[PDB]
Amino acid sequence: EEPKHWCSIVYYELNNRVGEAFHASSTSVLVDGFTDPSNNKNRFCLGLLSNVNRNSTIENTRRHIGKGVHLYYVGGEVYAECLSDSSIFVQSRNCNYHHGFHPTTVCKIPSGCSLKIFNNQEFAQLLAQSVNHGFETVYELTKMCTIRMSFVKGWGAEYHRQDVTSTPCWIEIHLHGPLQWLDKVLTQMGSPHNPISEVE
Amino acid sequence: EEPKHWCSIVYYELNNRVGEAFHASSTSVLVDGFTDPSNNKNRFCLGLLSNVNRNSTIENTRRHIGKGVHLYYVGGEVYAECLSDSSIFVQSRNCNYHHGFHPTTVCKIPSGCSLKIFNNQEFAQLLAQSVNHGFETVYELTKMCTIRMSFVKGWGAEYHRQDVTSTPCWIEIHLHGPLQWLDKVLTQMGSPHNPISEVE
Amino acid sequence: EEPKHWCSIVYYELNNRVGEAFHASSTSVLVDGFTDPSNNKNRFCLGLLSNVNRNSTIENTRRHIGKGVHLYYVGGEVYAECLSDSSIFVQSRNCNYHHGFHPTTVCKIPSGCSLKIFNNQEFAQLLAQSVNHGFETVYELTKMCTIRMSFVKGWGAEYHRQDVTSTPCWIEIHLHGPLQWLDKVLTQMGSPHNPISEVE
Amino acid sequence: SKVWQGQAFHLDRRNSPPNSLTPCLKIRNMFDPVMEIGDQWHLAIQEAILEKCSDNDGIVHIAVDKNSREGCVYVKCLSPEYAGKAFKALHGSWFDGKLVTVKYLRLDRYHHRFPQALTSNTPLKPS
Amino acid sequence: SKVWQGQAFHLDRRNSPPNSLTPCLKIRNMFDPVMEIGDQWHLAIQEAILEKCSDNDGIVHIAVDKNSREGCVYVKCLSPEYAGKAFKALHGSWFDGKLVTVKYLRLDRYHHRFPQALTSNTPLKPS
Amino acid sequence: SKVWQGQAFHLDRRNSPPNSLTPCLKIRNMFDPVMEIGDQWHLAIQEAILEKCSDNDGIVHIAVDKNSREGCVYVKCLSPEYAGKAFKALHGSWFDGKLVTVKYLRLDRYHHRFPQALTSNTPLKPS
């Protein structure tokens, strides 16, 4: 079954959310650093967004986003194509699970390269296998429905910026398809058999 | 007269707003901890929402939201029905005014219980009586058009968490009906006869 | 060419964003301090908005917003008309460029006065002249597509509040027309011929 | 189901019991008569009140209203101190998923509706 | 109504008066001729300028343009110092709800349009 | 165009090369046979692998699959140490805009498909 929007995107600068959320209305969405303010079709423009906590480091990185990233959803798969002149850095648990990479791995996509960052069938298969492992195992799959990604600046093990919140320009993508399918399993597994106080 | 949406809801974690606002499109809205990302009908799902300042305490509370709360608006009244396995904690000035409770009172709704948390006619009656008491008295009624409510963890006089901003998972509800009726009175009372500097 | 909405507005209290963004659907938009919650036509009401960091100073200023400001867009020009009983303080680079004022100048609009705060043709003319000065010169024009404005309290050179983020109640306006026209020039100028590291 | 589920808040400080000078109470939101079947269902309502007031040795007359949809049950006590003790036990408490509230009623009007309550003076207790 | 309402900003530092080397000014945005009635309305415009320039003992000729919708009034002074003093009083000030701006005009062209202004040399004052 | 563009991440610590006990590799995502023309195009694919493995003196047999759309090329080495050295050079690297991955293959099955590879033992090098 298909969702109203196949993904929604949110833009951050360091640890601060910037601008309104973007909701995709076509299979192709462009996240660039220009200034067209219609965020209701295929283009998510970041150049027009204001941030009262912006600094010189963030400002210089936004100047190099350029054409940015082309995210599209064709044939049950999601791709990231780096149209920018600078690289982008994607962390996708579903992509990492596919290639045997460590789940926390950040993949550098150099300018001009494309990477398959999600596969619907693999998630749906992982979801079905996860049901027999308990509620916590299926609830952990929520983490797989998000993809975080930064412009220009890298993050992860090799870089001084360990967390994506240390990068000056990044976005977070929510894959509504997987979230919908996960929801219909989570609502039929009940709740954890654990206690929680109301005072502590 | 009836508003486009009878309420809008906003979700917080401690002192941070999380996610986009929810706008009701039916008389029944569900706020639960699952992951369906369509926030344009009857379900407001919190499990899919990200927060870069989330910690272990908040994360454990979200696991126990479960089916959450059922808010519905039938026959000029608003109800809160606790579908969660853990309790919810509602603060409703209009509800408190009805029963003679202190205006700041927080009401524990145990799992399976329902509470009437607003009555339109009582507000409209209070509004008409308030007009003869001055602008400030009517402007104070703005506070009555919001209902704050937390999941799992209590707050108020008895609890170490004095303010709702100390609870890990809470929402704030805006009742658009009352706000609309209050607006048409506030705009016909002028302004306060007070001074304000432009320098201090 | 005309945009879907001619402007969008965002409300701040000190350094905190408050409420959802407002998108104009008519040539006339009213930003006042009352409580009508329909932010999908001509009225942007600030009285109903919550802020967990609000203090006594901000609260007293909101009481004096009153009828607020009337922003309208007729004949390729934008006007600010101060309907409030207290003054408003507008900073508009396009307005400053017109009269020879310093680009950072904040203009006090006393109660009852109107000021022309944007002219489309002047911007379009400045855009065409800017293309022959390089990418950076045209990208600087992004700053001209926003107008910041505070209620009651002044800011700028004369006031202790140097930045608008020191005022308790202000809004930021994004002019979608200019942003659209600037976008179609920025996307045809390429990118700056500068380097940026991925590690620093 | 038909169980007590604690209190919505603690009756102290800002929500202190009024301790009115009457021995008569009206208890609210305890049932819906159109959702009860037979004519034995009021006994479970009377017993539920005594179970929640097991400590109280002062309730003497109890009457369940089987017609009002408010779900009211009336109680009279020996002294206002006993009536206040029952107020603290019931007001703001959760029964069968609904919030119970208590109101004081004037003593003259109570006997007018329930004349049987004058002789009723032996304390009532749960089973 | 037809009142002065302060200045939009203070003319100092970054918005300093140019002090041009001319005694001639063009004052802008002071009225709309199509919203004035009769032919006595210009006196209130001339007096409003002198009331705002009550300190200035150097205005000698004042002319209101009753045709331009720009709402212009022309003034000539004795020396550029007097013209700068009138600039500071008017530029950036609020009159009848609109923002007044001032521009310097060349001296040769001023006399070409208003030849009467040569002999006009006595200072003008409010009533 | 047909250029190497670094690696998607560094193969160390959490993504360490397995160093399997085989000398045989399958290299992936290197081309699309339907977007190649002529029958000389495989030489550029073989040379690109040797250019990226210029240090490796242990590749002995290289075979490009011109039918699979997976874009596979098979390589056999002298010892598993040489095969691991080629793994580090290729796995996670960017070629012609696509991400190359490497998989180990069993030695018995490799010879079954490429029987020519037994005698192929002289090292291969770029031009």
Numbering used by the authors:
A (entry chain A), B (entry chain A), C (entry chain A): 266 to 465
D (entry chain B), E (entry chain B), F (entry chain B): 762 to 888
Paper text:
Receptor-regulated SMAD (R-SMAD: SMAD1, SMAD2, SMAD3, SMAD5 and SMAD8) proteins are key transcription factors of the transforming growth factor-β (TGF-β) superfamily of cytokines. MAN1, an integral protein of the inner nuclear membrane, is a SMAD cofactor that terminates TGF-β superfamily signals. MAN1 interacts with MAD homology 2 (MH2) domains of R-SMAD proteins using its C-terminal U2AF homology motif (UHM) domain and UHM ligand motif (ULM) and facilitates R-SMAD dephosphorylation. The SMAD2–MAN1 and SMAD1–MAN1 complex structures show that an intramolecular UHM–ULM interaction of MAN1 forms a hydrophobic surface that interacts with a hydrophobic surface among the H2 helix, the strands β8 and β9, and the L3 loop of the MH2 domains of R-SMAD proteins.
Co-crystals of the SMAD1–MAN1 complex were obtained using the phosphorylated-state mimics of the MH2 domain of SMAD1 (residues 259–465 (S463E and S465E), SMAD1C-2E). The SMAD1–MAN1 complex contains two SMAD1 protomers (chains A and B) and two MAN1 molecules (chains C and D) in its asymmetric unit and forms two SMAD1–MAN1 complexes. Each SMAD1 forms a trimeric structure with symmetrically related SMAD1 structures generated by a crystallographic three-fold axis. The SMAD1–MAN1 complex structure shows that the MAN1 binding mechanism of SMAD1 is approximately the same as that of SMAD2; the SMAD1 MH2 domain binds MAN1 using the hydrophobic surface of the H2 helix, the strands β8 and β9, and the L3 loop. The interfacial area between SMAD1 and MAN1 (the A–B interface of the SMAD1–MAN1 complex) is approximately 620 Å2. By contrast, the hydrogen bonds and salt bridges around Arg775 of MAN1 in the SMAD2–MAN1 complex are not observed in the SMAD1–MAN1 complex. The MAN1 binding surface is highly conserved between SMAD2 and SMAD1 except for Tyr366 and Trp368 of SMAD2; Tyr366 and Trp368 of SMAD2 are substituted for His364 and Phe366 in SMAD1, respectively. When the structure of SMAD2–MAN1 complex and that of SMAD1–MAN1 complex are compared, the distances between the MAN1 Phe770 and the MH2 domains of SMAD2 and SMAD1 are different; the minimum side chain distance between the MAN1 Phe770 and the SMAD2 Trp368 is 3.7 Å (between chains B and E in the SMAD2–MAN1 complex), although that between the MAN1 Phe770 and the SMAD1 Phe366 is 3.3 Å (between chains A and B in the SMAD1–MAN1 complex). This difference suggests that the hydrophobic core between SMAD1 and MAN1 is more compact than that between SMAD2 and MAN1. ITC experiments showed that Trx-MAN1(762–890)-SDED bound to SMAD1C-2E and SMAD2C-2E with dissociation constants of 0.35 and 3.3 μM, respectively.
